[PDB]
Amino acid sequence: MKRLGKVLHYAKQGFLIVRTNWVPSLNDRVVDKRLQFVGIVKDVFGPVKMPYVAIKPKVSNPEIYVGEVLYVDER
Amino acid sequence: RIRKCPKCGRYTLKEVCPVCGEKTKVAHPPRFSPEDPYGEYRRRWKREVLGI
Amino acid sequence: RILPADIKREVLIKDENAETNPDWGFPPEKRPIEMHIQFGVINLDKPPGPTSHEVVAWIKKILNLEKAGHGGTLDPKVSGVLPVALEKATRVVQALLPAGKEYVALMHLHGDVPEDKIIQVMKEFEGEIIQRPPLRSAVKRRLRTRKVYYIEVLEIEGRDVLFRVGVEAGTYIRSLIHHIGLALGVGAHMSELRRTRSGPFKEDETLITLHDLVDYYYFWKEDGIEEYFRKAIQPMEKAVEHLPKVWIKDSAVAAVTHGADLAVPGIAKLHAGIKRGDLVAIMTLKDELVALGKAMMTSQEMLEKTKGIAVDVEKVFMPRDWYPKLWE
RNA sequence: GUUCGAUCCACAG
RNA sequence: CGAUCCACA
Numbered sequence: 351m352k353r354l355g356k357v358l359h360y361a362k363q364g365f366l367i368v369r370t371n372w373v374p375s376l377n378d379r380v381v382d383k384r385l386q387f388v389g390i391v392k393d394v395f396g397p398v399k400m401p402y403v404a405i406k407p408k409v410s411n412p413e414i415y416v417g418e419v420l421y422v423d424e425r
Numbered sequence: 426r427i428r429k430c431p432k433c434g435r436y437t438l439k440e441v442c443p444v445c446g447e448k449t450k451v452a453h454p455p456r457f458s459p460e461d462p463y464g465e466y467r468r469r470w471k472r473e474v475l476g477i
Numbered sequence: 478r479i480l481p482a483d484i485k486r487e488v489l490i491k492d493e494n495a496e497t498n499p500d501w502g503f504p505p506e507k508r509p510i511e512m513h514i515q516f517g518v519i520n521l522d523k524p525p526g527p528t529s530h531e532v533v534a535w536i537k538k539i540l541n542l543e544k545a546g547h548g549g550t551l552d553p554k555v556s557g558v559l560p561v562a563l564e565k566a567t568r569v570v571q572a573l574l575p576a577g578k579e580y581v582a583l584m585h586l587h588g589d590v591p592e593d594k595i596i597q598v599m600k601e602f603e604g605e606i607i608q609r610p611p612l613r614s615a616v617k618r619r620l621r622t623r624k625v626y627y628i629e630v631l632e633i634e635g636r637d638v639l640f641r642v643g644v645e646a647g648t649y650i651r652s653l654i655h656h657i658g659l660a661l662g663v664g665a666h667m668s669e670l671r672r673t674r675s676g677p678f679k680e681d682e683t684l685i686t687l688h689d690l691v692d693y694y695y696f697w698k699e700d701g702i703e704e705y706f707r708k709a710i711q712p713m714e715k716a717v718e719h720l721p722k723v724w725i726k727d728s729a730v731a732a733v734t735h736g737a738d739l740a741v742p743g744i745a746k747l748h749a750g751i752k753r754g755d756l757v758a759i760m761t762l763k764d765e766l767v768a769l770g771k772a773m774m775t776s777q778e779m780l781e782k783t784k785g786i787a788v789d790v791e792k793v794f795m796p797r798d799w800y801p802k803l804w805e
Numbered sequence: 806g807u808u809c810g811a812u813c814c815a816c817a818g
Numbered sequence: 819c820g821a822u823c824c825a826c827a
């Protein structure tokens with residue numbers, strides 16, 4: 351359980367965007383606080399000390415995750 | 426199109442240098458035909474503005 | 478606010494009694510035109526349309542060069558500074574590729590965003606930024622990052638943003654723009670892109686178009702005039718103007734051109750702050766480019782030491798015969 | 806980073 | 819033998 355941060359917004363290109371303080375690997379699995387599958391890390395970018403993260407939502411309607419804290423799940 | 430101002434050098438989107446008042450041209454140079462169909466032509470008037 | 482090139486190094490004197498024979502070599506300035514060409518670089522302003530290779534290809538054919546190359550690829554829709562080293566100077570592009578670049582960009586946004594926010598987000602992207610996200614690893618891996626030295630937003634009209642950006646070699650502005658757009662939600666793409674700097678070469682009086690370049694060359698072959706064509710071509714030294722330099726003495730020049738590495742005792746003077754492994758330009762005391770190499774010592778070690786190998790010579794540019802064999 | 810040519814085998818006093 | 823220069827994968 352590796353806290354990413356709050357979902358800033360849903361991007362038109364179809365990606366949840368989180369600002370964070372570390373670097374997730376490509377394809378890490380992403381979950382919410384109640385622990386459910388939300389999508390996968392597809393891009394990391396911006397300042398190394400404080401990266402933006404782009405998540406491909408593997409969920410029906412993602413626009414409902416803004417404001418929500420997402421987590422990466424090693425195992 | 427990215428425009429350039431011939432006097433100040435300044436780069437702009439506008440038709441009039443907001444730093445040198447002058448009219449702006451496109452920043453990109455012109456296309457170049459590799460066989461340069463009309464090169465001896467361009468060279469003809471070029472010779473007469475350099476004094477050649 | 479500026480590239481690393483732009484930082485001026487200090488010059489340490491090692492042999493303060495070192496002098497140079499005017500009979501040997503050729504300062505860039507007083508090079509005969511044909512020789513000037515043989516060791517030249519053109520600060521070319523590439524046109525939208527061709528691939529960087531096609532451009533060079535044309536230059537080859539039109540000037541009848543046996544070879545040439547360019548100093549950092551520009552994509553076909555892109556214009557601006559494209560250094561083209563000719564003939565015997567061709568390999569100097571190696572000193573250019575690593576070099577910092579400056580562009581002027583047009584970003585088109587896919588939705589509407591206030592300016593206060595466009596400025597603010599864009600400054601998040603100055604500094605060390607992430608290029609390729611890492612891959613899942615069982616061990617601490619290397620992470621791909623490039624530096625953005627400065628982003629200066631020039632003006633904003635609506636969805637269209639025009640900015641100047643200085644970056645480390647290997648930074649894709651197309652990619653920067655996409656990432657920025659992603660960070661503003663609406664998305665974005667690159668409308669236009671012009672290169673305004675490539676290491677030492679910039680938009681100045683020496684920057685010449687394909688049209689002028691060919692025209693000036695005809696003005697020489699047909700009209701017997703060398704002044705214009707000469708002005709279009711720069712001394713390869715220019716290409717090496719952003720690198721740290723070790724100036725050797727005349728006694729050492731032919732040794733280097735004959736395949737010796739540069740030993741400490743051959744050194745007359747050097748730039749401060751050379752780290753082992755850095756790219757260095759070895760120069761004549763008349764400021765001719767003798768060769769490029771990797772530093773095997775630091776400025777300090779080079780300065781203090783009295784024997785040893787200072788620089789591993791990698792590429793030699795100067796003709797074996799400009800300075801006499803003075804060794805052994 | 807591997808094939809035979811060319812030059813040299815050079816601490817620069 | 820080793821470097822550098824030149825040509826070819």
